[PDB]
């Protein structure tokens, strides 16, 4: 599925991410835009073997199951697979557990880069939420 934009804003507000770990609505969503440019669908591989799944890019080598990064850790407990569902309740729940790890959204290098230290709010700007 590829979201609007104050479409994924209101799917996120309703599973919890607004302010979640004090992070506002907007950071959660400029991430997906530069992420995946908001598609459920996006994978990309890594040059450690590793591949990044889903609207927030959520990395094999530790967060979930894709049966072909050895070595690496399932820390969400989910086949990767999952986290493409047109649903985005599983991505949010994994993404809840990373941003709790101690470097909060830095673990989203397109947020670090992209969306840090901007303004975030434009990104919900005249959506019904
Ligand atoms: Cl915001
Ligand atoms: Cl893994
Ligand atoms: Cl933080």
Redesign the pocket.
């Known amino acids: 599925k590829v979201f609007g934009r104050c479409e994924l804003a209101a799917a996120m507000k309703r599973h919890g991410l607004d302010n979640y770990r004090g992070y506002?609505?907007?950071?959660w969503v400029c991430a997906a835009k530069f992420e995946s440019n908001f598609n459920t669908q996006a994978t990309n591989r890594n040059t450690d073997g590793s591949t990044d799944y889903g609207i927030l890019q959520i990395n094999s080598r530790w967060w979930c199951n894709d049966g072909r990064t050895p070595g690496s850790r399932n820390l969400c407990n989910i086949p990767c697979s999952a986290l493409l569902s047109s649903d985005i309740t599983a991505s949010v729940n994994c993404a809840k557990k990373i941003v709790s790890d101690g470097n909060g959204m830095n673990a989203w290098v397109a947020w670090r880069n992209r969306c840090k230290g901007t303004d975030?709010?434009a990104?919900?700007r005249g959506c019904r939420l």
Request: net charge neutral.
């Open positions: 506002s609505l907007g950071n975030v709010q990104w919900i």
